[PDB]
Amino acid sequence: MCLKLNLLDHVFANPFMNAAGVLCSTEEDLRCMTASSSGALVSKSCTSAPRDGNPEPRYMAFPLGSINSMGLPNLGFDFYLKYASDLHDYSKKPLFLSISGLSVEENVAMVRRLAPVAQEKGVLLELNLSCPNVPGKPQVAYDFEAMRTYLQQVSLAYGLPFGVKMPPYFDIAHFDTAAAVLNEFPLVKFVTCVNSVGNGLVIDAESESVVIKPKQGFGGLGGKYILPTALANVNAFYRRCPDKLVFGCGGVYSGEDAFLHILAGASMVQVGTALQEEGPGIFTRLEDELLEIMARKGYRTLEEFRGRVKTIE
Amino acid sequence: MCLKLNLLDHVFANPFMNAAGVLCSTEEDLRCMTASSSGALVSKSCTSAPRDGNPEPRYMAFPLGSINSMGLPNLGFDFYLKYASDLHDYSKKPLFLSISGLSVEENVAMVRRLAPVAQEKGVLLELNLSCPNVPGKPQVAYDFEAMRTYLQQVSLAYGLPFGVKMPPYFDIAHFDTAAAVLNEFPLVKFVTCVNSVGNGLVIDAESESVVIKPKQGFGGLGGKYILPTALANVNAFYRRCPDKLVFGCGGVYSGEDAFLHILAGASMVQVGTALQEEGPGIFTRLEDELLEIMARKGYRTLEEFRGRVKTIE
Ligand SMILES: Cc1cc2nc3c(=O)[nH]c(=O)nc-3n(C[C@H](O)[C@H](O)[C@H](O)COP(=O)(O)O)c2cc1C
Ligand SMILES: Cc1cc2nc3c(=O)[nH]c(=O)nc-3n(C[C@H](O)[C@H](O)[C@H](O)COP(=O)(O)O)c2cc1C
Ligand SMILES: COc1ccc2cc(CCc3c(C(=O)O)[nH]c(=O)[nH]c3=O)ccc2c1
Ligand SMILES: COc1ccc2cc(CCc3c(C(=O)O)[nH]c(=O)[nH]c3=O)ccc2c1
């Protein structure tokens, strides 16, 4: 009985990894994620220039999840590139580097530079589409013509297999259109579903106040609030993108949540809010929990049940 | 101390009502909602002709909320019109009727007939903008040109104050666009935020199966999962629609939850999943709990704190 997986020409001890933005911003964070029992890690989504992010408080968590408007605080691309080229120990586990440029040109400039390092060291790109573009326009993955533009230009500039981080969708016509766009791009080999559920609003009853400072309290939702949304997106893309891998992300706090993701079609399983709250110890628990469910069901590997969620009739 | 309020030229004993679809499909349901302590009731969204809806199981609830793909089962418009016209006791509480035609034409034909009953009896219209498919087209409220058309035609055909039931949005640009459309229509006097969060997917770990039969298990989410989404949408529209009321819907299980909706800007507060689960007794508890929070804070009226959620700096 086994959590091992081989994909994208890499070997992973188990399907677990951090979600981008969690425990991955500094060299200390990345070392800590590397020392954990996760199967992989991903760096914080980066921009060409270092960024302070939004004013604090900008993240808060509660029994059912989290809200954040971090504003892409990060040490800049040069730092994550150097971590990938010189500091990361690939004998420990694979590394994804997440990029989140504020325009298509900024993305192109980073990918062009990442390419030789990806070719030589095997760092894997995750391009964050659930990201701001021109203000007053929707985020890139909610604007299918911008999304197409970004993927064309990044495919050209990068020329190597990569994946994409997708916001959740809520409408079948959107699942359909989005997957069709992704399916135009053979180099997109994995699709990560989902980013935070956008612009929720948490209000503290005692203080009668929003709980984060940026954007009048509006921010992305993670955690228990979003598991069914996350599972729906995983399975929607799993079903529509048969030549691509899907990575699941949203609401994983237990091996059972991981099991559901995987049933939905997830290959890798990312952990955000629950990891921010519990710390990297969470990975041994998730592994032990998932292996317990497998034992009880008689499953020996992840492929025996990945994507095998049953429907009724 | 009492929770009485006046709006749209009607008096309401308190701000609570059912959410469209819940406990409101049959004469029996409507009579039950009338006998409750609710402040108002709304009928099941109707079509011109009766519908059986989707195959069962089509609704399921869990500790954090519910999923449904009912498929608009209803008795048909003639029945709700007759209820509004001959059966409802307006001395007990106001009635809203929800209409959800599958095209603009169907909507126009229903509202023309409702208009004289609205004039004569005071039944209020809630137009459901939240319907989905025809593979390749988004639900009307996610297609702003269709939405504008529906509201143009309905305002022309109906000619009296009405309200609209909105799905959640997730992106600030969409809030700005959606609100700007709604503000083109002076007869749109209330906006109900929000409908179920679209196309989530609940999977049972034990059976490895989805839990509702229609649409491969995909369906709209209600309950605790959606409270912060619902709060954001209420507040976003309350900010953007200063000449309209906003009615809150989503994740109300307690007086506290209702308090947060009203802080966010809600005038009326609709109860869906929690009402389905607990039954109509829920209304006495919610009134008590909301009055209790008020007394503790020294608030005498809903007006004193409606829309007064605090932001940070
Ligand atoms: C504090 C915080 C920072 C995040 N930053 C990023 C980021 O830089 N890039 C990204 O693609 N997603 C980011 N996310 C989204 C997470 O990667 C994940 O998609 C989301 O939190 C849902 O997973 P969860 O429910 O396990 O939290 C962040 C989330 C949190 C809570
Ligand atoms: C069984 C069921 C049926 C519903 N039917 C309708 C409907 O006919 N029209 C409508 O506008 N909303 C309908 N909804 C959505 C609710 O009115 C409400 O917007 C949603 O459930 C979110 O509120 P809640 O969190 O309190 O469940 C229905 C919800 C459920 C759970
Ligand atoms: C209001 O100023 C803002 C707010 C949010 C922003 C979000 C991003 C994308 C990075 C990201 C973040 C983040 O860094 O805030 N949080 C998430 O939940 N998912 C993400 O993909 C990037 C820039 C952002 C700028
Ligand atoms: C054929 O499959 C479907 C599935 C869902 C449909 C939903 C509507 C709108 C009625 C409605 C329903 C419903 O009746 O399923 N449920 C909600 O949560 N909100 C709604 O507004 C209308 C038609 C629907 C048809």
In three-state form (DSSP H/G/I as H, E/B as E, the rest C), the secondary structure along A40-64 is CEECCCECCCCECCCCCCCEEEECC
Which structure tokens are listed for B202? Answer: 């609940």
> CA of A47: how far to CAs of A70, A79, A148, A262, B245, in Å?
14, 10, 20, 31, 41
Pick the closest to residue B123 from B43, B19, B21 (CA basis).
B43
In this complex, the residue of A203, A259, A308 whose CB is nearest that of residue B309 is A203
* CB-based contact B99:B127 (threshold 8 Å): yes
Distance CA B126, CA B5 (A): 19
Q: Answer positive or negative: Cα dihedral of B294, B297, B302, B307.
A: negative
Distance CA A122, CA A115 (A): 10
Chain B hits for A201, Cβ within 8 Å: 228-229, 231-232, 235-236, 264
Judge: B203–A263 Cβ closer than 8 Å, yes or no.
Answer: yes
Q: Contacts for A298-301 with beta carbons within 8 Å, 24 or more apart? A: A299/A1, A300/A1, A300/A2, A301/A1, A301/A2, A301/A4
Q: Which fold has domain A54-71+197-222?
A: Dihydroorotate Dehydrogenase A; chain A, domain 2 (2.30.26)
Chain B hits for A203, Cβ within 8 Å: 231, 260, 263-264, 309
Q: Which fold has domain B1-53+72-196+223-313?
A: TIM Barrel (3.20.20)
Pick the closest to residue A119 from A88, A161, A79 (CA basis).
A161
Residues belonging to chain A: 313
* CB-based contact A57:A212 (threshold 8 Å): yes
The amino acid at residue A174 is: H
> CA of A92: how far to CAs of A95, A255, A268, B110, B211, in Å?
9, 23, 17, 66, 40
> Is residue B135 classed as helix, strand or coil in its secondary structure?
coil
Which atom of ligand 2 sits closest to the CA of residue B20?
17
Q: A16: distance to nearest CA of chain B, Å?
A: 18
* CB-based contact B130:B141 (threshold 8 Å): yes
Q: A82: distance to nearest CA of chain B, Å?
A: 34
> Could you tell me if B2 lies within 8 Å of chain A, comparing CB atoms?
no
* CB-based contact A18:A270 (threshold 8 Å): yes
Which structure tokens are listed for B144? Answer: 């702003």
Minimal-distance CA residue of chain A relative to B57:
A312
Distance CA A284, CA A38 (A): 8
- The residue ranges of every structural domain in chain B are 1-53+72-196+223-313, 54-71+197-222
- For residue A137, the cross-strand partners are A135
Q: A15: distance to nearest CA of chain B, Å?
A: 18
* CB-based contact B232:A201 (threshold 8 Å): yes
Which atom of ligand 2 sits closest to the CA of residue B249?
23
The amino acid at residue A255 is: G
Residue B215 region by backbone torsions, left for phi larger than 0, else alpha for psi between -120 and 50, else beta: left
Distance CA A175, CA A178 (A): 5
> CA of A118: how far to CAs of A90, A179, A267, in Å?
12, 25, 21
Distance CA B77, CA B50 (A): 8
B228 preceded by a cis bond (ω within 30 of 0): no
Give B162's contacts (C-beta < 8 A, 6+ positions apart): B111, B124, B125, B126, B127, B154, B187, B188, B189, B190
Distance CA B301, CA B298 (A): 9
* CB-based contact A223:A243 (threshold 8 Å): no
Distance CA B195, CA B177 (A): 18
* CB-based contact B161:B8 (threshold 8 Å): yes
Half-sphere exposure of A18 (CA within 13 A, CB side): 33
Which structure tokens are listed for B175? Answer: 């809030």
DSSP tag of A75: -
The experimental technique behind this entry is X-ray
Resolution, in Å, please? 2.0
Burial B255-265 (b: 16+ CB within 10 A, else e): bbbbbbbbbbb
Helix (H) or strand (E) holding A33, with range, is helix A27-35
> Could you tell me if B139 lies within 8 Å of chain A, comparing CB atoms?
yes
Burial B52-63 (b: 16+ CB within 10 A, else e): eebeeebbbbbe
> Could you tell me if A181 lies within 8 Å of chain B, comparing CB atoms?
no
Give B127's contacts (C-beta < 8 A, 6+ positions apart): B98, B99, B100, B107, B111, B150, B154, B162, B163, B164, B165
